[PDB]
Design a protein around this ligand. Sequence first.
Ligand SMILES: *OP(=O)(O)OC[C@H]1O[C@@H](n2cnc3c(N)ncnc32)[C@H](O)[C@@H]1O
Length: 71
Amino acid sequence: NDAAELHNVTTDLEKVCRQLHDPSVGLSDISITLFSAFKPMLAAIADIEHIEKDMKHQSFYIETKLDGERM
DNA sequence: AAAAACTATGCATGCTCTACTGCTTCTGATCTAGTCGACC
Ligand SMILES: *OP(=O)(O)OC[C@H]1O[C@@H](n2cnc3c(N)ncnc32)[C@H](O)[C@@H]1O
């Protein structure tokens, strides 16, 4: 049921296969753990005249985008 | 005095080292084109 979330949190098939072996017995909690790669958070296309509607009408942070490698 | 036996020698064969020169083939170094992995 929650294989995708655990895989994203841990980024390893072996751990997902081993921990989530039984179908009924799941994991109570799943979150980023030490020495376990996690999927980075990306950004979607930005509407140029709906920013406020996208921000729910609150102050927002703007920062110059950097051309490098995400790590 | 005359005939037969032993030794000197000497020229030619084949082998052996020793080297030299040429061709064929294997190994190694270098250059160039193509390919894979990671990202964005
Ligand atoms: O085009 P894209 O979706 O790959 O761009 C988003 C990625 O770029 C990273 N990024 C670049 N610059 C920044 C800043 N200033 N802050 C946060 N992330 C940034 C994103 O993390 C993403 O991988």
